């Protein structure tokens, strides 16, 4: 399915530390970030996505239209400008963030009752698993 609608609760968060370090996020921020449960809300209407990922610490709001390039300023993470593009590869939602960092992006897909999100930066991969609430 390409339907990723819902309120999603984080089950696990593997190598978030490595991904953030690859993004040059400072030590103290990483130490807080790695321990927090995230909730991801996805409002998907055709090709229009509105997503909010939240924790006790920080919020990440990102909206996009599939197949439409958009500029991003990654204010909630490393503070960089990237050219982002989200597209479908089969049932996998694929984001490439073109800019300074190589192999920067993510892939997101539904398997059964779970949402999987794999974030990449350089040689680092963070794997997050969410279940629907």
Swiss-Prot record:
Its main location: cytoplasm. The keyword Coiled coil does not apply. Higher expression in adult small intestine and to a much lesser extent in fetal kidney. All-trans-retinol binds at residues 40, 108. Pfam families: Lipocalin (PF00061). The keyword RNA-binding does not apply. InterPro entries: Calycin (IPR012674), Fatty_acid-bd (IPR000463), ILBP (IPR031259), Lipocln_cytosolic_FA-bd_dom (IPR000566). It comes from the Eukaryota. One of its GO terms (cellular component) is nucleus. One of its GO terms (molecular function) is fatty acid binding. Forms a beta-barrel structure that accommodates hydrophobic ligands in its interior. Intracellular transport of retinol. Belongs to the calycin superfamily. Fatty-acid binding protein (FABP) family. This is Retinol-binding protein 2. It comes from Homo sapiens (Human).
């Amino acid at each position: 399915t390409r339907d990723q609608n819902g309120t999603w609760e984080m089950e696990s968060n593997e190598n978030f530390e490595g991904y953030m370090k690859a993004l040059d996020i400072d030590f103290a921020t990483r130490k807080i970030a790695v321990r927090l449960t995230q909730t991801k809300v996805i409002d998907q209407d055709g090709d229009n996505f509105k997503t909010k990922t939240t924790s006790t610490f920080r919020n990440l709001d990102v909206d996009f239209t599939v197949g439409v390039e958009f500029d991003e300023y990654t204010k909630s993470l490393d503070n960089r400008h990237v050219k982002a593009l989200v597209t479908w590869e089969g049932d996998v939602l694929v984001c490439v963030q073109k800019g300074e960092k190589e192999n920067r992006g993510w892939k997101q897909w539904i398997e059964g009752d779970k949402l999987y999100l794999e974030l990449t930066c350089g040689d680092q991969v963070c794997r997050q698993v969410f279940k629907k609430k």
